[PDB]
Symmetry: D3
Subunit: 270 residues, 6 copies
């Protein structure tokens, strides 16, 4: 209902401990209209290299919004209104495997959705769409993230299955045994779904850079929120370097053959 | 979330007894995406004179949707996505005044909102808008409707205050005495609000052609749904003639000086 | 979804201070299925004279449900499932006029609906119904109530306009001046609407026996909940006598010519 | 709240690609009252052989309703009000196993519910019911469907576990590996639950005829909505033949000994 | 669910154009738990004179929240958790009378509620409360506001009826004529209700300092949001002086004899 | 919003077949305020030994509330308002293993949450909390329950994984095979989650005493509601003895060292 005059081709969605992405030189905060109401915060917009970039902290100012209350539709709609083509999510995750250690990055390639009662789609009728997500992340962006990590010499696992739980409580031991044994999951978080679904429906090229902030239930002392925040804080500098480099590496527009969600809505529409 | 290829500059919203507007030569039915879900029906689009026109029956096929359940936001959003600039509503009303006759048309110039449980706006935050509705209908379209009625020699009252009630029950006698003797309202219906509000927010020029289908509680036998249906049926041919002529008469774009809602969002935005 | 084996032709809905109607000799409590979930309480069913009667306290056990949270649809649906044809409401009201004194009964003949955001109908589509309620109470039942009061020599006003407000707060002085001066209201309460609407839609013969429990804002000390409960308690015996007598007076089925809502759905259905 | 004059003993619920069942000789479309609002479309009612049959396309006209927005309660309630005793569902599914072929029918005998945000029951209180679903489909109807397929020489698998997912997105590879390798499910879709639950609660004998329209993520090219549509279209004639024959074959009333849900509410009611 | 260590005896709720109250010397922003979710913003807490004061902008940062979406329950709950006893609202209003001029303050003593569909109470059951609102504002605080304005020689009307509308649209001419000529309202706004009700239920001493920012529909050019903003900006300094002075004048606790909501819940409980 | 004068240190939440706990000598029923509306019933409070104990039947009077509609937040809030530190749940469960026999008690130590669409937390923002649930039950209370069962010579399994399903339908055979063989669950029920989460967030010491009432799908005749009721009736006396003994054994306050939720909110807060 509003003409959005601001434009950005790249969107960053920041997770726990990343309210300030530390990537902008000059920037401003803007309110963006959505038919779903409030995005998590005003969007920060500014130039990085030759790129106009939009940033949004998914938990909002002061980490005031828990995963189950995030307005995922408003956040993705807002980025779409700005013309965003690439979406880089930075997230905090638990590790369910010994070799994915604290402070390691992970560029997941799969997910398993264990959320409950979230709003999963932009398409509620009369235009019905069923997006394919066999390979749910954008291949081209994943590959560029991996290349960036390699170039920077930042320890990064190049695949992984993210299990997304509802929260806000952390998992029981019986649940975590299931995640690791039943679903073959590698990392765990609360915010990936429906963010990734909605980005795909919006024909964006979305990928997650996850950082391991805890060992879930598997260390001598189980995960706590305090641990997650502490570990993310210890590693923000690395995250910012990776982010700054990746943003400048991105081509103008995602390749069709390397982005399954780009322009693929046609075969998803009934 | 999808590109709307179809375009129409004029939208008709049909009320009771007007499922088939009887104005189209060639037409087709389309599904239009909205972030509010289902419009009342598929939109009918087709060419009349040099105009592309979209039609929507607000109660849907078979009059299946009562006023309190109409998805007003989806209906107006759908018309907006088609590029509609002019919205002509045709509506059945009761007369609260006994100097009017059944079958008279009324082009109201004011309203009083007594609705109770509706969604009134497209603007729920963070972009806050407060649209001026002192003169709630589009003056240029009202004037053109009045000229058309005069040209056709169709009996039409050129002003009036529409009181919009919640329904679906009709008013009590005590309520109607209030509407007429105290509020000084002229006509009564259930569907004007929030349709008119939303059209204004969408920067569309909106006007109502109301036809008097009953005398509310004031005749010997009080209004019934059966009477409304019957009287509307007796006068549909007249309504179609008025509609057909008006559509032909409209200029391509409403003037900013004769449309208070056209391009006026600027001063409504906080 | 459940076959209701219990049957009653008369339903009593008790208001403030009438959790125990004091009319039954032998009775039992039953759970009644509704597609709207929970009625206010289990229904009490038992014989009075030759009549099977169902009783429901609208505020539930311990007056635990305020007017804005009453499941009006469930309550009326439950009575319909039992085969109820006559519904007698007993209510506590404020008086807006000096001559309607504490402890006086009133058999209102009109109402004005000032409620907000309640669920007003059983008909949400695809079967659309607009019930006439020009004279919103059942004439035959009102007349029988009036006759009963006359026979018992119980002081009772034989007409009156009930203004129904949302609550739970009581009215401001400016509001009450409006009710008495703008809407020409005589008594005031919070529970009549949508109970009366829904009873009409269910083709029941509904009437209210109101008792004046306070003078709203117009006495030296404005109405309080404590006053309402105290005054109702002082007059329960009278209310019970009136109720017991009226119940036995009722014909088997309401007369068609004396019940506007009985079998009148036909002309209300679009 | 209104008396349903129309009656049918058999109900068909059509899925993707089956808006027109192509089984009726003479038929009409009716609006059916429900306390849950709108069924997916008007019901089509007509006579086939000696049977009165009701048909409902679960996605509505133009496939306008996605699985997560279908009003399952209204659809089943509507069929119940028509007196339906047998419900035949025809549904498009993916195969999770590579020994099946596209176009095969499957008559599943089990399901696993992975849906997320639906309304699962007609019983929200105060009448609490917990229906047994150990064998969730009606055995007598499954057996008759299997016999019909054998008689017609239509390739049909006579058992299988249907995993129902939330959608509208299709599964990730990690999810599908779980569904097949761990859960041991055979077919996958989005619409079975809560349709089957609700039919059981309504004491109707329900069975699914599923047709394999894709191999989910397991073929060289993963499932798309386009493929589902295309493959269903290739096999509609076969589906119609099966449906027409089965309908003719049904006895007037399912047996209590071969229908676990028929007249079994007794032991489910607390 | 958490212990609130921060304390304040006075709460300020700021309206349009008052995001920064300009009254604090040193202060900090805090997040306050409520069972209703998010207050409009973080609460600013700091010392003024010998008083600990809490401030909340009801529209939030950047005026992002419109009146119909304000979480009134969370705002008032948050203040209650801090121990607030006095609540001073500062609000922009339209004047319905040409002698209440732009920039004049008004200390209303009455209100009329024309809102629709908001959440009006903290008491939804099983503890039912009906607060008396005959004189809806705290007399002691009104009197102190009036004294302060007199002492500062700031032009202030010492009574008035505030009519609260739903918005976000402004009133039609017919509505405005009704508010003035029929309801006898003096000023108009969108935010007073349910804020004032909830403060009363919370046993706070609440009063409004209103500033006239427009003449609604009654000037040559009807009210716009731009005008409201502009006029409030022209008078903020004056409002801040009034506010700063009043805050220091307040006694430690409101006297029960001059605060009808203070410790009066007892007689409101059924 | 009201001061709760009543106090209890121990809360009992009774499940199926335990409306009357049979532990009180003298007691009364009280209404307890919550910002979430109605607890399942009035709370019974009374003294046992030197302990003030509060009792709540989670299904309410007459087992009127099914698991999916229980107001878990109101129930736990109400207990918190009373000062409850220990919460003993008594629940009917199915056994997924043929060595956990009918009438056996189980003191589970783990759970798996398969519920859908319930409200899982008291913390919706702006105070975000992620409670640790690795060992979801209070160890100190579990140990005391186990000791009590040993002392009374009541057959009790001293560990086990409870899988919580949504209901109200019972599981299919395919689901049940999955719960046992895949998730490694031992017992199954519908009410544990979110009750246990919310108790942890409220810093209570919560444990479940489960009684095996059926073998789910694994006996010759699958579970029915009638069977659950019957078997629980056969063992109530035993459950009451266990309960009465345990209540008296409890120390005044749970030791922080043996209660992970006690005073642990600090590290859960972001
Ligand atoms: C600040 S702590 C809460 C955040 O931690 C992330 N997270 C980190 N570790 C885990 C874990 N082991 N399980 C679930 N979510 C986690 C979640 O996505 C959530 O937003
Ligand atoms: C077909 S009957 C119901 C319709 O009648 C219109 N209507 C006609 N007369 C009246 C009246 N007197 N009061 C309210 N609505 C009316 C309403 O807008 C509604 O959609
Ligand atoms: C027990 S106090 C609350 C009840 O009093 C009734 N009532 C009595 N007097 C009044 C009044 N003056 N205004 C509004 N409701 C009233 C209402 O319907 C409400 O359920
Ligand atoms: C027309 S494409 C969408 C439909 O396909 C059905 N369907 C077909 N194949 C699959 C699959 N592999 N996974 C989930 N749903 C499917 C679903 O029930 C949905 O209504
Ligand atoms: C910034 S413009 C919108 C604000 O103006 C206030 N307001 C000012 N003038 C008026 C008016 N004439 N009618 C209604 N609200 C008004 C309302 O409370 C709203 O929050
Ligand atoms: C009175 S029957 C319904 C109750 O049985 C409990 N229950 C008992 N056995 C089972 C089972 N096998 N599966 C699920 N819930 C069960 C549930 O928690 C529910 O409240």
């Amino acid at each position: 209902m509003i003409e959005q005059n601001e434009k950005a081709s790249i969107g960053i969605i920041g997770g726990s401990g990343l309210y300030d992405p530390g990537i902008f030189s000059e920037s401003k905060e803007i309110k963006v209209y959505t038919p779903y109401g409030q995005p998590s915060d005003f969007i920060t917009i500014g130039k990085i290299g030759n790129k106009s970039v939009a940033f949004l902290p998914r938990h909002g100012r002061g980490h005031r919004i828990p995963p189950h209350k995030i307005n995922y539709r408003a956040n993705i709609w807002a980025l779409k209104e700005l013309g965003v083509r690439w979406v880089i999510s930075v997230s905090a995750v638990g590790s369910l495997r010994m070799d994915y250690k604290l402070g390691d990055f992970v560029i997941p390639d799969q997910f398993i959705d264990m959320t409950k009662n979230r709003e999963y789609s932009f398409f509620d009728g009369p235009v019905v769409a069923h997006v394919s997500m066999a390979d749910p992340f954008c291949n081209s962006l994943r590959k560029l993230a991996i290349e960036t990590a390699k170039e920077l010499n930042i320890k990064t696992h190049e695949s992984g299955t993210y299990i997304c739980i509802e929260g806000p409580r952390f998992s029981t031991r019986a649940e975590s045994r299931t995640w690791r044994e039943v679903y073959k999951a590698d990392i765990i978080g609360m915010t990936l779904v429906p963010e990734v679904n909605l980005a795909c429906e919006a024909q964006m090229c979305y990928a997650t850079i996850a950082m391991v902030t805890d060992y879930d239930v598997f260390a001598e002392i189980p995960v706590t929120a305090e641990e997650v925040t502490r570990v993310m804080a210890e590693n923000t500098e690395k995250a910012k370097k990776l982010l700054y480099a990746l943003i400048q590496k991105l081509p103008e527009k995602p390749e069709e053959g390397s982005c399954s969600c780009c322009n693929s809505l046609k075969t998803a529409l009934v």
